[PDB]
DNA sequence: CGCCTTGACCAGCGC
DNA sequence: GCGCTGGTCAAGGCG
């Protein structure tokens, strides 16, 4: 259902942008008590017809990876 | 227009 | 009840 994706990214790209075939609207960004890097919160470009939610944050275990986390599935292709 | 920012809002969950 | 934590709002700008 809610999948997870680890993406190698240079540590200078601090945008937390993960290209994944969809476009997204950013609705927040917060630091969490276990990772001193920010977590970005997105929703699908097809919201609210689409329920997919998105989180991107740099892995605390491997700083060379971003972690992208999704919730739900789309109803489109674009 | 629409997206990003950022601090404020929230609620729920463990005591 | 209550402090904490992540998740979300919604206002102020800006390409
Ligand atoms: Zn979608």
């Amino acid at each position: 259902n809610v999948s997870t994706v680890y993406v190698p990214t240079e540590t200078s790209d601090t945008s937390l942008t993960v290209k994944d075939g969809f476009q997204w609207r950013k609705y927040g960004q917060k630091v969490t008590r276990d990772n001193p890097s920010p977590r970005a919160y997105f929703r699908c470009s097809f919201a609210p017809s689409c329920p997919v939610k998105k989180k991107v944050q740099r892995s605390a275990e491997d700083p060379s990876l971003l972690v992208a986390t999704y919730e739900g599935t789309h109803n489109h292709l674009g």
Side-chain angles (χ1 to χ4, degrees), chain A residues 1 3-78:
Chain A
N1 194 326
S3 56
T4 297
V5 171
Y6 305 88
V7 170
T9 301
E10 294 163 356
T11 70
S12 17
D13 184 329
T14 173
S15 73
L16 304 194
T17 291
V18 182
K19 333 274 190 303
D20 53 6
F22 301 93
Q23 291 195 325
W24 310 88
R25 316 185 174 102
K26 196 172 200 159
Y27 69 105
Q29 192 178 301
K30 278 195 65 84
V31 183
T32 59
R33 261 302 296 277
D34 299 61
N35 191 312
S37 282
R39 174 177 301 174
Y41 301 75
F42 306 97
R43 47 172 50 101
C44 188
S45 35
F46 287 76
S49 156
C50 184
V52 164
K53 291 270 217 259
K54 180 167 168 187
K55 277 98 202 186
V56 176
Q57 178 168 36
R58 202 157 213 112
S59 172
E61 271 63 22
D62 204 334
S64 57
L65 309 181
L66 271 24
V67 185
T69 273
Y70 301 85
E71 286 170 32
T73 327
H74 302 272
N75 27 66
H76 42 90
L77 295 81

